[PDB]
UniProtKB/Swiss-Prot annotation, chains A, B, C:
Keywords: Amino-acid transport, Cell membrane, Chloride, Membrane, Metal-binding, Sodium, Symport, Transmembrane, Transmembrane helix, Transport. L-aspartate binds at R270, S271, S272, T308, V349, D388, N395. InterPro entries: Na-dicarboxylate_symporter, Na-dicarboxylate_symporter_CS, Na:dicarbo_symporter_sf. It is a multi-pass membrane protein. This is Glutamate transporter homolog. SUPFAM superfamilies: Proton glutamate symport protein. It comes from Pyrococcus horikoshii (strain ATCC 700860 / DSM 12428 / JCM 9974 / NBRC 100139 / OT-3). The lineage of its organism: Archaea, Methanobacteriati, Methanobacteriota, Thermococci, Thermococcales. Sodium-dependent, high-affinity amino acid transporter that mediates aspartate uptake. Has only very low glutamate transport activity. Functions as a symporter that transports one amino acid molecule together with two or three Na(+) ions, resulting in electrogenic transport. Na(+) binding enhances the affinity for aspartate. Mediates Cl(-) flux that is not coupled to amino acid transport; this avoids the accumulation of negative charges due to aspartate and Na(+) symport. In contrast to mammalian homologs, transport does not depend on pH or K(+) ions. Residues 255-283, 332-366 dip into the membrane without crossing it. Changing M305A: Decreased dependence of aspartate binding on Na(+) concentration.
Length: 410, 410, 410
């Protein structure tokens, strides 16, 4: 009988938890929480960490397959590096937000009561090589995202080159195989949506605990995050888009007035994928060639998830300082390196950035299995339902603003 | 040149072993056995444990795919829960047999000379979550059937939902991918048959050892098992079928006289799969609609393996008490929970229930790799060639008796 | 801008390294090498060891699929065992070369400064069973080639039997699934070629180090290898081919004069695969039936890589004695057992035998991860670009000489 609009359904869990949390935050100790409540939350998270691999894998082989040079027209080539570098400065800005805002510093948690100290990172030499799977499956089997990616990529590539062969039996193999991976990719997504319906019961149990414990000083950071994001966000639109809108003689203001229908749909639908109908509709509405938006719009909804890139860029810096940890340059550049190759997986749905987070964590040697991290992420996940809104509303903006740029360039 | 009818071929190994065992049971110590003989047996078992995963996996994703709601007509819906609950009480009865018969108590073995004590089971909290793979591959890679299942299922589901999409490229992906898994599924089966031809040389080496050692007090349990089964079995037909045959105004006695051809073929062919021709033949023979038996008969031959459910239900209780172990309620209900989701894999062939056993073992934390268990299962496997006969002859009965019930209901 | 003909491109790295090595072999200690140079080499090797599994797997399931009895005409049957036994004596000869030549004895290396002593090999009993994967994935995940093979094979088989079924849905499954594996298989190959373009930068860094260290006494073995090979090689042609050419009343000398175009193309192209056009051209040129060379030539270019079989047969014996190790009979027969089931994978491309080497190593418990082995293989790999030439030129010869033999037999 649970049919309600997801977003509220969650916001229902979200606003109602806080209180039931804080009201149980004074009276019956948070331990009842800890034993009767958390058990429902984690399942959630676990239900996510579950997917991370297949979807880190499948997604990126297929990801690569779309981008694979030059199984793309010079029209893509143009738009491609738009996306890269708009996704690239996106996070550059995420750090800026996260270097002027320090949410998590002043929350620092002891977990079980023990502070966390990271395991030593191997000589820069090794770390390189370590990207090269010693053995695909053996790497794939257990964590080690650094290679998992590397590989899957090189596959995607190799694959595109197989459809371009003399032999037909061969030319074929690719198609199928590839296809099959894809869909695995897809299935994921749909479990994601299945998950994002336990998401209400979920988000409730998690945050309630984080409010039950940590007192209330928490929300101060939580809205301090929300800030760091939106304020990053809205500024991104001004600093990058409006900046490049005029740089090809397109009126930025009007552009928005057109995209006003689609964006303020993305805001509330959060599905960069299911909101394709709306997107391509506005496309022609503002005078874009069929043969141009028919290709970019179905590609940027997936890749160039510039909004995600930031989210992580920031979310990262929340987590680290919540452990009271300092992020060493080398991994500061990793965050992004990752955070980008992250958004090449995503297809732009509900949980999206959340799961990736893990991914960016795991790469930077912050194993979730570690309770410190665990209880911290746990927060960000709760609220993710919110940040997600604006995030996906910008992912979308980012896609049209490329489209119009290559339609004028075209 | 080894061409002989499998069943005899085995019974040949089976009856001839016992003697050559017991005759070597008095004279040249069983150690010669242990060093020249067992080495051939185990290979067998190993040849089985080998398959368990793929076939625990492939089978259940595809399993799910057939059942996936509502990628089935309301005609299935009806028959579905017949099967469930006839498979469900089936094992309920298996426990009854195994609580009035206690085969294994009075055989209790020391293995290397050390008794076995089970590893502590995690707090009921964890055990739940532990069903959610932390990471598919990483779980899939090594045991942990509890999740392997959970997952594969949720996949099967997700998959059916992919063929029901707007996008065609998508609608496709499912089909193929799915397909491909399926066939992996199938291949298994055919190696199974390839195995069940080493089965003669196999069953010989195993039991001979168990007769070489353990003296003879063993057969007392072995025929005490055979009992517990058949007597469960024949009674199942009376207590359930004849019970529900009349409960829709169908004459049970006649029904049998019709099914008399097909069942007494299943008894001897043991292939719930290859015996489909015979099944559907009798179907119309007793007045069943084409559009009704064309769907149930090709589905119940695979799922609703009620005979299997018991076999395990019982086999379980043999093993445990052969170690001198007591089966805690919580895992007593697991056996079944499992034993059912077991028979959703199986396609109904030779080794069938045997392999699953492992599956139900592994779930209930009884690692075969442990010699105690190892030598015990080892027995059940030998004789499985027999119990199998009646077992598959009932699996079949169970399928027609549903069919006629929904054809009258229809 | 790196476009140059691969072979030179490498020989360029190869001849130029030696010197820059030896010149840095007297002056600035080899340690600069060790810290600025090796790091580039290994990557290479790592880039290979990476592939070994998929391609050990995919290749052999599909391998099996071609050979699977009797999903082949009695025309294959004939040619099949030609290939087997020409691949079989091939290596028999490889040992002969490697028992009269002892390259590596007189190079013996201390690695870090510690000699290597192999881990004890389990009782011959276990080792057998150990071929039967305890669990496919779990084996597949981490090394254990002995089973990986065994399994994949039994699959290939099982698969062919699935396309020969009553059920169509089934008949299908096989096709796709199979296909899909295949192509994975293929992709590999193409990354191989992608690798064999870092191969110049690669082969440079590796050998330079091995010249930087070990002084120069090395080349003495390196050309002593080159010897052991070519001299094995050219003799193989005389001892086997010319021997069996006349044994069916075909003139060996002429045969060569015909194959003179194709072989001396294989020598320089090293691609048993891309050189199929040339092969089948000469086929009719020397009077071979369309319906005969259309089947053997596209099968022997892949299987019956008799040249490979030797390479390893020998390469093995280089490595072992470079560690100062003695190769126990039981594993001496393994080398081959392997080395053959090796060449059933390969499709006959650039790196080919190199990677397999690993495979034959891993089986004979010589983990590359061990630096001793590591620095040694490392040599063989460098020069492999050379030996490869003759090797593939004979693989090819081996294929026509079967073809003509079954065309006369036919
Ligand atoms: Hg995660
Ligand atoms: Hg098992
Ligand atoms: Hg290797
Ligand atoms: Tl986007
Ligand atoms: Tl994406
Ligand atoms: Tl059945
Ligand atoms: Tl089944
Ligand atoms: Tl060849
Ligand atoms: Tl091959």
């Amino acid at each position: 009988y649970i049919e309600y609009p997801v977003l509220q359904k969650i916001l229902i869990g979200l606003i109602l938890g806080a209180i039931v949390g804080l009201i149980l935050g004074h009276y019956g100790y948070a331990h009842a929480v800890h034993t009767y409540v958390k058990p429902f939350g984690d399942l959630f998270v676990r239900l996510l960490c579950m997917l991370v691999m297949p979807i880190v894998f499948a997604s990126l082989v297929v990801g690569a397959a779309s981008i694979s040079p030059a199984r793309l027209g010079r029209v893509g080539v143009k738009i491609v590096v738009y996306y890269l570098l708009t996704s690239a400065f996106a996070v550059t800005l995420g750090i800026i937000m996260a270097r002027l805002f320090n949410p998590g510093a002043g929350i620092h948690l002891a977990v079980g009561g023990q502070q966390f100290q990271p395991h030593q990172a191997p000589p820069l030499v090794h770390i390189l090589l370590d990207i090269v799977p010693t053995n695909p499956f053996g790497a794939l089997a257990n964590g080690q995202v650094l290679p998992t990616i590397f590989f899957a990529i090189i596959l995607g590539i190799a694959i595109t080159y197989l459809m371009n062969s003399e032999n037909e039996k061969v030319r074929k193999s690719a198609e199928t195989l590839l296809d099959a991976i894809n869909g695995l990719a897809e299935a994921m997504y749909k479990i994601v949506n299945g998950v994002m319906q336990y998401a209400p019961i979920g988000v409730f149990a998690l945050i309630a605990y984080v409010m039950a414990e940590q007192g209330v000083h928490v929300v101060g950071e939580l809205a301090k995050v929300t800030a760091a994001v939106y304020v990053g966000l809205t500024l991104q639109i001004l600093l990058v888009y409006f900046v490049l809108l005029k740089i090809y003689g397109i009126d930025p203001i009007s552009f928005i007035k057109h995209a006003k229908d689609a964006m303020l749909t993305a805001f509330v639908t959060r599905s960069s994928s299911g909101t394709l109908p709306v997107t391509m509709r506005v496309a022609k509405e503002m005078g874009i060639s069929e043969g141009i938006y028919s290709f970019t719009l179905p590609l940027g909804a997936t890749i160039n998830m510039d909004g995600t890139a930031l989210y992580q860029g920031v979310a990262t810096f929340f987590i680290a300082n919540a452990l009271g940890s300092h992020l060493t340059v080398g991994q500061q550049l990793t965050i992004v390196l990752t955070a980008v190759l992250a958004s090449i997986g995503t297809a732009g749905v509900p949980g999206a950035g959340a799961i990736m987070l893990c991914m960016v964590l795991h790469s930077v040697g912050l194993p979730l299995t570690d309770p410190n991290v665990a209880a911290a992420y746990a927060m960000i996940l709760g609220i993710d339902a919110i940040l997600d809104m604006g995030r996906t509303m910008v992912n979308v903006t980012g896609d049209l603003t490329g489209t119009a740029i290559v339609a004028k360039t075209e």
